[PDB]
Paper text:
KKT4 is a multi-domain kinetochore protein specific to kinetoplastids, such as Trypanosoma brucei. It lacks significant sequence similarity to known kinetochore proteins in other eukaryotes. KKT4 is an essential kinetochore component and has microtubule-binding activity. We recently reported the X-ray structure of the KKT4 C-terminal region, showing that it has a tandem BRCT (BRCA1 C Terminus) domain fold.
Our recent X-ray structure of the C-terminal region of KKT4 shows that it has a tandem BRCT (BRCA1 C Terminus) domain fold with a sulfate ion bound in a typical binding site for a phosphorylated serine or threonine. We show that the BRCT domain can bind phosphate ions in solution using residues involved in sulfate ion binding in the X-ray structure. We have confirmed that in solution the BRCT domain binds phosphate ion in the sulfate ion binding site previously identified by X-ray crystallography. Mutating the residues involved in phosphate ion binding in T. brucei KKT4 BRCT results in growth defects confirming the importance of the BRCT phosphopeptide-binding activity in vivo. The in vivo importance of phosphopeptide binding also demonstrates the potential for rational drug design to target neglected tropical diseases caused by kinetoplastid parasites.
Author numbering: 474 to 520, 525 to 616, 628 to 645
């Protein structure tokens, strides 16, 4: 978060549809209350992503299925601090200056992926992430771990 302490850069005025992933109950409620308190066209949506999703709140790097789906569908991935800092500033801050992540255009789109791992929940989840991003799983990018898929996704264009 490298905002200016004098004139912190404002985010665009536009609806923000927040979801959270893998937060504690406590910090999810604090994020909810802060979104509700600032308002300014933002709402917290309840739980794969709700179709109205623009922003995913998560602590740390993308790890959950919801977070990876956000990575590959050009959602903003922001830390809880994005919400609290914006409430402190009095308006929604610029997502990029706050350190938020967004990968546009959708990486994986029209890309083909060979998942060199055995069958199981992890392979199934990665297939769903690939498809959610508009990619196809080969029944040209070889992936042996979710980590490798994430590094591909954040390093395009």
């Amino acid at each position: 978060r490298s905002p200016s302490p004098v004139d912190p850069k404002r985010g665009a005025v536009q609806p923000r549809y927040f979801i959270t992933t893998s937060l504690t109950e406590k910090e999810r409620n604090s994020v909810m209350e802060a979104i509700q308190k600032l308002g300014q066209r933002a709402v917290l949506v309840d739980n794969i992503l709700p179709l109205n999703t623009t922003h995913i709140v998560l602590r740390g790097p993308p790890r959950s299925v919801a977070a990876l789906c956000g990575v590959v569908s050009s959602k903003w991935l922001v830390q809880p601090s994005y919400v609290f800092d914006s409430l402190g500033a009095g308006f929604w801050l610029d997502e990029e200056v706050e350190g938020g992540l967004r990968y546009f255009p959708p990486p994986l789109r029209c890309q083909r992926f060979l998942l060199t791992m055995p069958e199981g929940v992890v392979k199934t989840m990665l297939q769903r992430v690939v498809e959610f991003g508009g990619g196809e799983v080969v029944g040209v990018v070889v992936v042996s771990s979710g980590d490798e898929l994430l590094r591909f996704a954040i390093s395009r264009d």
